[PDB]
Design a protein around this nucleic acid. Structure first.
Lengths: 150, 52
RNA sequence: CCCACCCAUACCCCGCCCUCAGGGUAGAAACGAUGCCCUGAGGAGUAGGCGGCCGUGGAGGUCAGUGACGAAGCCUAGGGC
RNA sequence: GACUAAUCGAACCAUCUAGUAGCUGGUUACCGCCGAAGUUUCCCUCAGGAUAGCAGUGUCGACCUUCAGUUUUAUGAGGUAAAGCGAAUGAACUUUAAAUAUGUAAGAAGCCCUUGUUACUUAACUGAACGUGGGCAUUCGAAUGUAUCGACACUAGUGGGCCAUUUUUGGUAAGCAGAACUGGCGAUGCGGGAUGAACCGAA
RNA sequence: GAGACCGAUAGCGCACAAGUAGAGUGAUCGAAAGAUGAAAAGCACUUUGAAAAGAGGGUUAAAUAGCACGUGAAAUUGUUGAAAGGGAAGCGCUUGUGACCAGACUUGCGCCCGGCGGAUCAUCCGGUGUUCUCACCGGUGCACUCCGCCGGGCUCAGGCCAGCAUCGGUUCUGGCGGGGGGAUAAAGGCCCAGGGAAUGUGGCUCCUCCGGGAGUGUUAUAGCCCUGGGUGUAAUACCCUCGCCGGGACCGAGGACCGCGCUCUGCAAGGAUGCUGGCGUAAUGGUCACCAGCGACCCGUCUUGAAACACGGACCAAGGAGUCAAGGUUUUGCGCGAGUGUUUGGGUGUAAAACCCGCACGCGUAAUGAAAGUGAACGUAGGUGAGAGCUUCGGCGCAUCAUCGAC
């Protein structure tokens, strides 16, 4: 016998999505290839967040994007691996280039009306395969009723 | 695919240590001591050794 | 006090199973990528917790499925996984 | 307290009614991965409760910072053995110093200096506290090990059991009775003690 | 009129002369029980029996369907066949015997000759299709070219069990040649020079049983002990160590090459090949029954810490116990998103489906207070320290945490 005071630890992170979305499966295959064949940490972060569940992908609004676009970030490509929502409190949308998992209809319309560009994550992989000149944004994770009641 | 003991397989010993053939050839495991007449044990050493 | 000897699921070497971990795999002559290849470690278990599979009655789809030249059921010191 | 259709300290029939039980009994395929526990702390006890601790699944965060039932070093406790008193003095003597285990501490997240304030404190701008600025990366300041991280969420059993070595406190005619740590068992097969909850070896 | 309901121990108690038969004075209680065959064709006739029935012989597609009737399981029983048994059997590991079996194999592919039978040989031309350079179809082959078939020969690969040789991996065991160390072993032999003694050799003396005793004294007609020296760096033991040669056992994972190497025409170097024999079937292997050696308590359940006690279990078949609804909560998937929810209802329909519509309403978008009421930006929605990612390499800094501020 071998005395094992310590225990070998099985993985406590997602290795694959629980979702059955076929397009998400194709995106996961593409970003698995990118994370394997590139040095860019952006690709690994994007792959890991593609694995994530919905409460771990809180929505990001246009006002949050506009806040993070200030101070030299106006020309960077905004990357969100959640839903980009519209904020009607923001009356003037700045010109921006946003790549997201999905957009609401009003957010897409307001970005295109302000003159920015809307992309999917496979288009982001085509144009910035190393994540160059990107601004990676996450939504407020703790802004949930369950988290308030914890 | 298979660990081979270099103490039994002479090819593996030559792979790990190219000086093994020179060791065996020059017989460095059978080096004789330097010549010269050995001085005898001093008398006081034997007296202390056999002292009751 | 000394020499040799006997054998445990313990220890050493080797094979096989499973689990865990770490790697490789697209200008695809290219893959049940939910796959395949390489390497290492580990294996008792009540209360309890989790995962994967097997089986039964019925429903949708499908196999241009089986069947009076014998369906289902039943018996079987007959076999295969 | 007899008898009232084999029914009587309150007959028989149907219904409410599938009445209630904390007590008894039972509770249905396989394999794989983990895997336990008995005063910790509080509450008036028994016909008592929570609660710490120990477990499993999910995740997430830079799985980042390192940490550790261990030794060493410095210093405590145990000065207790011991050596000497041609050192002084006389376990209570001391230059020196035991064994077993044992507390505390051992870095850049650190150390020191300087400036002010103080509503602390001090005779006191004095200490200390709070800020301010600066210096110290020339080695980041023992060893050994390090698939050993952290934070949530949800779920589950057990939470005043038995035996034993040691330490300690009491006792008896003799038995013995309390605590503390540790190990084992309840949950566990194997080799040996012919045999077997508590023995030896080994999981 | 229907069903993602039940299928005769189910479904109503009742699929049947079922609220019947039966029970109770009565109020009331209350079952069991479906299936020959397509058609009775439900066995003429003969024979044995008192009869029931039996045997022949028909009927049938089938009586292995005979009004005991579709199928006909188990418990349990009879006969036949095989086997075991000295106060239980059953079970596990492993042989053996007997009985009974599943595979595998029967030859394949490829070259060289000879004999046939045919031209869907190569090239070129035209048409068509394609992946746009590859193919298909028609003409040309005129037989040293293609395609089949038949006879020979040869190589390779082929089933089961084995033997030997050369290797690799692991391991057990025997022998041999060297090196080093210590008091450069200690001893010991043979010499040299000193010293000494008794369990005193020779000699001498005295007693005897004539066998031997006693005494004296230092090598003599034996020897011993102690010290120092030489041979001598002697040998050997013990310990440590470098190699060499045998004898035996178990195993052969992988499957083009790649690598590290070496003794380099090649190899023992990132894992077994080569040669040979018998057999080709129950021979190997497997299943069942039994004997033999060793191993092996009767299952739940309860209790406590555990045992013991206690309780349940004669046997077999069929049922037989964490379900549904409402309301929470956390997590997973999905749609839309500051909104979201068509289905109370209306429209429509191939009619309980599907499709479509919208007012209100619910929840969310604002909180706080008992209430009256009031009601969220000093600042690029603040400062500081961390922080993934990005960066023009100066910094920008997500989520999140800590702290100080603002409303």
């Amino acid at each position: 016998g071998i005395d094992l005071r310590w225990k070998h630890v099985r993985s406590s992170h997602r290795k694959a999505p629980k979702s059955d979305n076929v397009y998400l499966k194709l995106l996961v295959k593409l970003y698995r290839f990118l994370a394997r064949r590139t040095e860019a940490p952006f690709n690994k972060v994007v792959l890991r967040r593609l694995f994530m569940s919905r409460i771990n992908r809180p929505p990001v609004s246009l006002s949050r994007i506009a806040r993070n676009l200030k101070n030299g970030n106006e020309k960077k490509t905004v990357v969100v691996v959640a839903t980009v929502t519209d904020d009607n409190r923001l009356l003037q949308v700045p010109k921006m280039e946003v790549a997201a998992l999905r957009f609401t209809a009003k957010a897409r319309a307001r970005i295109e009306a302000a003159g920015g560009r809307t992309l999917t994550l496979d288009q982001l992989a085509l144009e910035k395969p190393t994540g160059a000149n990107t601004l990676l944004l996450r939504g407020p994770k703790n802004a949930r009723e369950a988290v308030k009641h914890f | 695919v298979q660990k081979k003991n270099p103490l039994r397989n002479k090819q593996i010993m030559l792979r790990l240590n190219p000086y093994a053939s020179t060791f065996a050839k020059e017989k460095l495991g059978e080096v004789k001591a330097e010549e010269g007449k050995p001085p005898k044990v001093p008398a006081s050493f034997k007296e202390l050794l056999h002292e009751a």
